[PDB]
Homo-oligomer: A and B are copies of this chain.
Amino acid sequence: TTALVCDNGSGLVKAGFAGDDAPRAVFPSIVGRPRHQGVMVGMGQKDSYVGDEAQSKRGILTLKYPIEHGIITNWDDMEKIWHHTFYNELRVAPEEHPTLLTEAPLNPKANREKMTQIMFETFNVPAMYVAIQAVLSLYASGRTTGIVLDSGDGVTHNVPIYEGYALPHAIMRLDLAGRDLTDYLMKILTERGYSFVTTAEREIVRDIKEKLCYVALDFENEMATAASSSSLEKSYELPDGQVITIGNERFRCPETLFQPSFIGMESAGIHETTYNSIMKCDIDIRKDLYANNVMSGGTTMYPGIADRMQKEITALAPSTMKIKIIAPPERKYSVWIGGSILASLSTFQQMWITKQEYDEAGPSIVH
């Protein structure tokens, strides 16, 4: 049997077998219990709706993302995510396949152990391994050097890798993008009188965060032309018939990635965390970290990136240095195409942690 790559998204959990095209299942991670009393008599209602069904049944449930700030809320809901994914999307039994699971870089111990341990006893997989989402994006882009960005709602990361070794002393985790950008967009859309305070309605905010937002070339000059009469406004239509016109806030929300002072948080922008991680690496290596700046994750899919990022880095970086920023299409599925390449390779079959070895070793094998 065929191995299964299942990505523990922050979004947007992604699932598909090993090779060779695209993921089979992608869905918004949400679990939602019903906040109102039923009067139908069937009864016909589920105890907890997962996505996609919880995104079709908005407004009668209370949506709860099971992974928040890069860590799982409880494994009771997480197990339901897994069960739903394997059985009613992929249509496969875990006993049939070796699996490949993903994690986030700088995640607290003992949450990789507890995960691995529960998943082996609950789903009875014959072998498993847990890879960080950032490392996998190297394979997806066909690179062997560069700084890797796993940016999902709501934890971004900046990991530098050099042919083909990782540098522990320069790894940066920012809790900045993207769920706090969702919350910030909701705070500056209230300023235009649209009240979307409720949990369900927050998903609609997320959808306009995808579609209508853009990044400026320079903030001050976009603000200048905003003061002018020329329309930057785009009109969105809402499920109850309402028409929302956003303009100024449209470029304000993504610009936060370069200026976190908009949220009021002390942390520095992607601009400077890129530079400061490069300048924590040895002198000879710095040469090839420039021009292997590879963006990844769905929250980097705004149009004005990477050429904003490019212009800003080129201004702070040493003169006459070659800087190219690598941003392909499909960054949301980058991780999955990474994992797919990995699990197909020899000899990594023998790098998987198998059940008998796990049973003897216990949680200490993980690291």
Contact = CB atoms under 8 A, between A and B. Distances in A.
Tally of this chain's copies: 3
Contact of A37 (B62, B166, B196): B166
A168 interface: yes
A190 B242 contact: no
A164 B39 contact: yes
Given A36-B165, A190-B108, A282-B59, A198 B266 contact: yes
Interface residues of A, number: 71
Main secondary structure of the interface of A (DSSP, over half): loop
A242 B165 contact: no
A285 B345 contact: no
Contacts of A285: 58-60
A2 interface: no
Contacts of A220: none
Given A60-B165, A108-B192, A192-B108, A342 B41 contact: yes
Contacts of A142: none
Given A199-B266, A317-B241, A38 B164 contact: yes
Contact of A166 (B36, B199, B321): B36
A265 interface: yes
A287 B239 contact: yes
Nearest to A45: B164
Interface in A325-367: 342, 345, 348
Contacts of A201: 282-284
A224 interface: no
Given A285-B59, A318-B242, A40 B106 contact: no
Contacts of A345: 41
A200 B282 contact: yes
Contacts of A264: 35-36, 167-169
A163 interface: yes
Contacts of A193: 71, 108-109
Among all A-B residue pairs, the 8 with the closest Cβ atoms? A40-B164, A241-B318, A108-B193, A59-B284, A59-B282, A240-B286, A58-B284, A36-B165
